Every structure is written in structure tokens, then in C-alpha cells.
Design an enzyme around this catalytic site. Structure first.
Site: not given
Lengths: 418, 418
Positions: A180, A204, A172, A119, A110-114
Site C-alpha cells: 500500500s 508505530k 496490519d 496531513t 490521506s486524512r488520518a484514520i487514527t
């Protein structure tokens, strides 16, 4: 919706029956639960938590509620990264490395939020990244592997609605995370799954001990779903490769793949991850995994495998990475004082890069001419900043100065008394 | 011995009048107070300690009841290192580098029981270690610099005796430490002095924060000595230079001197260290110290100055570093697995190197082919063990194997789930 009553039960800390969890997810999915409710449920999880049984029910409940695909080829193989390390273009190498063995790996990202670049974004630069779920089955069966943007299809939709709540509250809770990450894998319903974790500071999961705790959660949860999973603890000290941002990461990735020669971080991480997959796949016997991948990647077979993927994607297979675009606007930082590099800060780099406009602008990114522990003399370039707008290149620069991402030190750390 | 009366006072925590400090020292040097009393006194300090006034009074006193030297040349410059790093032959480069400026620089070194090779030990390999206190002045005036073994001289003899107790008791109280280090320098009554404090893990001073506190302590006391002192924290993370053991370091140190080109770890430190002195000396204006020192060594002036010293020492200038003897039988370690070195344990190497039996055998030692951050393919040499006699070497090797001194790691730090 009475679905709320179940939510309240959690508020009081009670465990949830599968019946209860589904009703909530079911309602979440049907847009019968608006933002107010998801937020409360989400808040409850951080406060009260979910014991494992709930999580497995959740993963399944979340997943079963979304389109699923079954691939004729088997067994399905997948790679996912907890993420948090900038410049992680590796996954791209692995799918091809894994696929050539002929094992099946449908990789969705998925397109990255942060992150500076998701990728998915990196793939998009040289190939199409969005396809119908049906479209996906064909590619994988035909080519045996794929890279596609996960978001532009519906899987674990409850999760998508859910994410907005966490980010807004900036939290989170773990149970939601495992659900998820895992459920979406389940919708793909891959049999063997490997999870990759970057560990360090600016990652992270900073602490390895914490990282180890995750695997157990990841592996054990897989059993609940009957998925064979392996957790890999990965070096996270510096951003992988010397390229950050989609255009750059892509260039870096294809060139390694094509040449089979690359920066150690990329080649080493990718091969290692790949090898574990092969062992799980059974293509290579225990302990031979690193070897097959290097040979596989080294062979150039992997590049060839990638070509099929690019071709299916609609990207021209031949394309020469060197000819890829990069932003015209650029600035480069000369090193302030001669020495060796004590440290590189990832959180900052991403931030310096995002300022440049990645990933909205593919050209923008950062290129590093140096790695931790590399000796420096005044004037050696530490990194180069690429932007497609002057306003951004300038804004990035301010950040670059405050942040001081590349830290250079000498034998005399400090002098006291003048 | 009424000195005891004063000693008991320390037990009760009272401060000590100079006469009291003086008396105790007077008795100790005189042999009036034997081991029971010295330990007892020493013990009180760890438990109770001293304010700077006491440390200062003590420093002189230990100093006064010992030979002292007055030097015609001025100002007097002395460089001393707290130690704990291995392979720190760095003082050797600095002394010669300092001399070319022509600023005066008497040097006293004591072979370290803990250390694999004493600076005195390394200098001895290419020259003669010990001289009469009277001789040194003669030697110093002719060339202005010297390397000698402090031990032959009766300096702070009070110091020697207390040490047995400390090692025996395994405690080094700070107040006594400053005195021992400072008093001897004061006896030279050196005008200007500098302190090196290798900082890292496995170093005597593990943390930088600890180092800062000492410096205030070190420089601050010097004022009591009316001595201008500057303390520089330095990097102790890995062994300095790549040669450990007196001969090897010697080959390494001298070659660096002739070449002007050497391993980065040593050259940068020596040069950097030299600068504080030159700048401190005033030969060079502030901020120009590192540069001038680099040039002086590069000019090759330093090697020659080094040349004068060997002659004074009875060492031979025509001497060719390469031809220095080394252990006949050697064993080296190939890399266990492909990867990038993560860390090197300094404490471990010294034991490993001492195992070869240095410094009793100059020949025995360790030479390292790899340093941290250096990618190592499987089978790359990590280090090499040199020994005069085998029983030791095997003994050495055995020690090495337990220790695993050089550590190599990969992107996949750990694999969970099999």
C-alpha cells in the site's frame, strides 16, 4: 470467482505467481470479491505471510490497476512518513523546501484514520486539498509541487477496500503495508523516494532495530520497482512542534515557513528530511543537504515557493497565519508540582486531542507550552486544549486527567518510609 | 584463632550467634585475622549471605570495637549518600541548610577511591579536613554541624580491612555494605538518618526496583539500630551540578550557598533532601520540608551557618568563591554536529575527570556547559577540562575522545540507503 482458489492456496501457505496475485487484485478491484473474501485473504497474510517476490508483484498489481500519472518534469521526487508521531506537520515544510530547488515533488497524503489530524487536513485549512488526477498534473508542472488529499482520487483502489478488513480485524500484516505505501507511490510513479520513520515508544515502530528492518524491506522493494529509496530513522520521543490538530499545526507550519524560524523539532526534522531529498535529487552534493534546506528555508525562498502552492490550491497566498481561527472553548493545565518533565506520552496526546474532535473539527487540538526536559515550577502551563464544543472540551478533559500525559519529576523520584 | 571455626560455619551456611559475629570482628579489629581469613570470610557472605539478624549484630559489633561519640545536643541527624553520581557536592548544601533549623547534624565523609572528588575532598579545599574525635564534639556543639574526614578517626576499623578484600575481589556483598555504611553512623549513634540513592544508569544502583529493595533493607535495619531512617531514591541520570572535581564543585557549591541561586540540579536535590530531615526532625510539619529548606537557603541563613563551619574548620568566611584556584591549562570540546544533547555518560566523565588526576590535584576537573535536552548548535562548548599539569590533560583528552562523553543527536537519528 476462481480467484478464490488462489486465495486458498495461500491459506495452505503456498507462494503466489504473478498470475495468481493479479487475478485476486484484479477481482478485488472489480468488486468481484466481497468483504468475506478479502478478509480471508488478509487473514492468511498475517498467518502465512508473503515472501518478497509476492510483495513486489502485489505492489505492482495493486498499482497498475489504478489510474496513474506521468509528469513531464523529472525526476519525480516523493516523501512519505510511516507516521505515528503526533504533531507531524513537517511534511508540509519539506515539499516547499524540496520544490524550490526546482525538483519535482507531488505530495499526496490521506486524512488520518487514527491521527488527530491528517496531513491532508492541515493543508485543507489554508488551501484546497482535493483535485482531479488531471488537475494534479497541471499544478505540479506549473508550480512543480503539490499537496493534495490522496483519497479523493482512485489509486491502488484494491488497497482501500483492503484496509477496511485490517482495521476491523485490527491487524496490519507487513506485506500489505509495503504494497500500500509503495504502490501508491508508483502510481505517481516517482523515481526517487524517501521514507521517514518515527522511532520511539508511542510510535508505530517503537524499536530502532525494528525500524532498521523496515528500511531494508522498503529499499529492497524499491529496487523491485526500480525506485531509488532512502529510509530515514527519526526521533519520535515527543510530538513534533508544540501544536497538534489541523488549525494549530497549520498555524505552526506556515509561521515557521514564513519566518524561517521555528520550533527545533519542526525545523530540524524538515530540513534534514529535505536535505536527503536534495542529495538524491542531485541538487546538493553529499553532506551539503542540511545546509541547502536551512538556507533555502532560511532564505524565505521556501515560503515563496509555498505561496505558489497555496495559490494553485485556491487558498489566498497572502494569508497571515496569525489570523487563523481556533476553537473558542479552551482549557489549560497548570503544572501540579514544580520540577522538570520526565516524559510526554504521544499516544495519549493524540487521544486527548481527538476527544476534542480533531480532525473532524479543525479548530480542536492541543498546544504544548513545554518540551521534554523543560524545567517547571507549579503553575507553568503544560498544554492548552482547544475545542469547538463544550461537550468535547469536557470529555477531553476527563481523558487529560486520567492520562497524565505531561509527567513531571524531581530529583527525589520517590521517598520511602515517610 | 578459633574465629576461623565460626567462619567455616558460614561456608556450611549456618547462621551466626552474636558471639560468633562478635568474635570474628574482635579478632579482625585486633589484627588477629589477617588477609587470608578476611577474604575467606568475605567470600562466604557473597556466596551465602546474611539474614537481617546477622547484619544487625555485625553492624553494632564493627561499631562497638571502635571509638564512639555521645553528643549533648539532640536529636542527631546524619545524611549519607550511596553515591555513584558525579559532582554530588549536594551534601554540602544540605548540612548547612539543616543546621539553620538548628537541628543537630554531625557529618562524616570519606574520600572515595572510585570517585573523582571526595566530599571530604571538596570541603577540604576551602577548609581543613581532619580532626580528632574529641575535637569534633567541640566543633559540633559550637555550631552544631561539621564536615570532616571520617578516615582519620578509628571507626569501624574492622571496616577498613575488609574493604581491601572487596575491592581486591571486586565484590560488594549487601550485608557487609549495610554494616559499613550503618555501623559508622551508629557509632555517632545518630538518632535520625537519611539515605540518598542516585538512580539511573552508570549509577551504583541502576534500577529503581533495586533501590526499593535496599530501602526496606536500610530503614528496616535501622530499627534494629532503633534508628529512624528514611531512604530517598534520587535522579542519577546525569552529573549533579555542572562542576566536577573538588575545587570546581567547591566553587559551585559555595556560590550556590551565597547566592541562594544555583544550578537547578544541585539546589533542588539539596533542598529536597533537606526537607526529609527537617520534616523528619520535626522542625517542620509534613510536606513543608522542601519549602522551609528552600526558604532557609534563600534567606541566606544557610550560607552563614556554612560560615560558622569554615571558621571552626579554620577556613575563612571572608573567602570569595570566585577566587578559588583552578587548573592553569584548559581544553574544552566544541560540538561535533548541530543537534540536541541526547545523553551524558557519568561513568565516562569521572574517568575523564580523574584523568586530569583529581582528586590528587584539586585544580584538575571538568565543568559542563551543557546538560541533556539542551539544543546545541555546532561549535557549542560541551565541557572544559582543567589540569594542573599537561601530560595528564593530554592523557585526559585522549580518554575523552574515546569515550565521547557528551552525545548529541538530531531528528534524523540514522540514515539508511545512503
Amino acid at each position: 470467482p476462481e480467484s478464490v482458489r488462489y486465495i486458498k492456496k495461500k491459506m495452505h501457505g503456498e507462494k503466489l505467481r504473478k498470475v495468481e496475485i493479479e487475478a485476486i487484485v484484479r477481482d478485488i478491484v472489480d468488486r468481484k470479491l466481497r468483504d468475506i473474501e478479502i478478509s480471508s485473504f488478509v487473514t492468511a497474510l498475517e498467518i502465512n505471510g508473503l515472501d518478497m517476490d509476492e510483495i513486489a508483484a502485489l505492489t505492482i498489481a495493486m498499482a497498475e490497476t489504478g489510474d496513474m500519472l506521468d509528469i513531464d518534469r523529472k525526476p519525480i521526487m516523493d516523501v512519505h512518513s510511516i507516521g505515528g508521531v503526533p504533531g507531524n506537520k513537517t511534511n508540509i515544510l519539506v515539499v516547499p523546501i524540496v520544490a524550490a530547488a526546482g525538483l519535482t515533488i507531488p505530495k499526496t497524503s490521506s486524512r488520518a484514520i487514527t491521527s488527530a489530524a491528517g496531513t491532508a487536513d492541515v493543508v485543507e485549512v489554508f488551501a484546497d486539498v482535493s483535485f482531479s488526477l488531471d488537475e494534479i498534473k497541471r499544478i505540479v508542472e506549473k508550480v512543480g509541487a503539490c499537496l493534495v488529499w490522496g483519497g479523493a482520487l482512485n489509486l491502488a483502489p484494491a488497497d482501500d477496500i483492503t484496509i477496511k478488513a485490517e482495521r476491523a480485524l485490527s491487524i496490519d500484516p507487513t506485506g500489505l503495508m509495503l504494497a500500500s505505501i509503495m504502490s501508491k507511490k508508483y502510481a505517481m510513479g516517482s523515481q526517487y523516494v524517501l521514507i521517514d520513520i518515527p522511532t520511539g515508544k508511542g510510535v508505530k515502530v517503537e524499536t530502532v532495530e525494528e525500524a532498521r528492518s523496515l528500511a531494508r524491506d522498503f529499499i529492497e522493494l524499491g529496487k523491485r520497482l526500480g525506485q531509488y529509496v532512502e529510509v530515514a530513522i527519526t526521533y519520535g520521543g515527543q510530538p513534533i512542534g508544540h501544536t497538534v490538530g489541523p488549525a494549530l499545526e497549520a498555524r505552526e507550519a506556515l509561521s515557521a515557513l514564513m519566518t524561517g524560524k521555528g520550533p527545533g523539532s519542526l525545523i530540524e526534522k524538515a530540513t534534514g528530511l529535505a536535505g536527503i531529498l536534495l542529495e538524491m535529487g542531485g541538487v546538493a552534493p553529499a553532506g551539503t543537504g542540511k545546509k541547502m534546506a536551512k538556507e533555502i528555508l532560511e532564505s524565505g525562498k521556501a515560503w515563496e515557493k509555498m505561496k505558489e502552492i497555496i495559490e494553485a490550491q485556491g487558498g489566498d497566498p497572502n494569508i497571515k497565519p496569525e489570523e487563523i481561527p481556533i476553537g473558542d472553548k479552551t482549557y489549560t493545565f497548570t503544572a501540579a508540582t514544580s520540577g522538570y518533565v520526565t516524559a510526554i506520552d504521544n499516544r495519549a496526546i493524540t487521544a486527548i486531542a481527538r476527544a476534542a474532535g480533531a480532525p473532524e473539527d479543525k479548530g480542536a487540538g492541543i498546544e504544548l507550552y513545554v518540551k521534554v526536559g523543560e524545567k517547571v515550577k507549579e503553575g507553568d502551563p503544560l498544554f492548552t486544549i482547544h475545542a469547538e464544543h463544550e461537550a468535547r472540551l469536557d470529555q477531553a478533559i476527563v481523558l487529560a486527567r486520567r492520562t497524565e500525559p505531561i509527567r513531571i519529576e524531581g530529583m527525589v523520584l520517590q521517598r520511602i518510609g515517610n
